[PDB]
Amino acid sequence: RTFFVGGNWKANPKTVEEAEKLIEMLNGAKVEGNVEVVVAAPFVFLPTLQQKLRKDWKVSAENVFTKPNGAFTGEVTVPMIKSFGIEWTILGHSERRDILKEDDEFLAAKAKFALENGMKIIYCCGEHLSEREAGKASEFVSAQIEKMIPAIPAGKWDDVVIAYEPIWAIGTGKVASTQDAQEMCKVIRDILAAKVGADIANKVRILYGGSVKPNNCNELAACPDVDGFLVGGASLEPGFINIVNSNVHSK
């Protein structure tokens, strides 16, 4: 499976000038090994990112709606994104599930519509503190993946990437170890194998989407079931390149 690194800028930077500076930085980075790099940015910066970003990397939206267009004030749709030539979106990020109240049925509908319309998706999942403390992480995560599975059309698993977020380690006072990341990526892979078969499970990139930095990316990349990263704050910094280049430690 080709190592995969997505840079999620989240709601940053504040200005188009800063977005442009950051893109110029990314454009000059020397990538080593073999890695698929995707960069996700706020909607209003997507046109400039699409125009200016190095052509060997791909741009991603950070969310889309469930419909092609219509009476959905404030929402951006798959056709709009594709009209710029953008091929990816993130879906189901913990911040949207939590702050913006997106539920599993909404997210399944987005995955279905996105894929049926030629998009590739980075679909996020992961359990909260109480399920982690109860030792019920795999059950929680399995229920999420099981909502996702029926949305994937036949022949589209090549267009699906899954990101595991250890939400239990985000603003909770607990930290995730390298072994935690490996264990949950493997839990997801096994759920896929059981539910949709080994051939799909062996192809789907599963990413670690907890805290990824230059000081922990090499050890994380080396975990056998970690196929890359959905990077948060380091996406905005020169250390993003170290994370991209961690692929040489994954086999």
Residue 100 is a binding residue for a second copy (CB under 8 A): yes
- At 70, the amino acid letter reads G
Contact partner at residue 68 from a second copy, Na ion, none, CB < 5 to 8 Å by partner kind: a second copy
Q: CB 22: neighbour CB atoms within 10 A?
A: 24
Residue 173 is a binding residue for a second copy (CB under 8 A): no
Residue 74 is a binding residue for a second copy (CB under 8 A): yes
- Please, are residues 112 and 160 in contact by the beta-carbon 8 Å criterion? no
Report which of 109, 120, 53, 55 is spatially closest to residue 81, judged by C-alpha positions. Answer: 120
Pairwise CA distance, residues 87 & 211, whole Å: 25
Total interface residues for a second copy by CB under 8 A: 43
Contact partner at residue 250 from a second copy, Na ion, none, CB < 5 to 8 Å by partner kind: Na ion
Catalytic, 249? Answer no
Annotated active-site residue in 62, 93, 102, 128: 93
Pairwise CA distance, residues 210 & 212, whole Å: 6
Residue 69 is a binding residue for a second copy (CB under 8 A): yes
Residue 47 is a binding residue for a second copy (CB under 8 A): yes
Nearer to a second copy (CB atom), residue 131 or residue 165: 165
- Largest CA-CA distance found in the chain, in angstroms, rounded: 48
Residue 99 is a binding residue for a second copy (CB under 8 A): yes
Catalytic, 131? Answer no
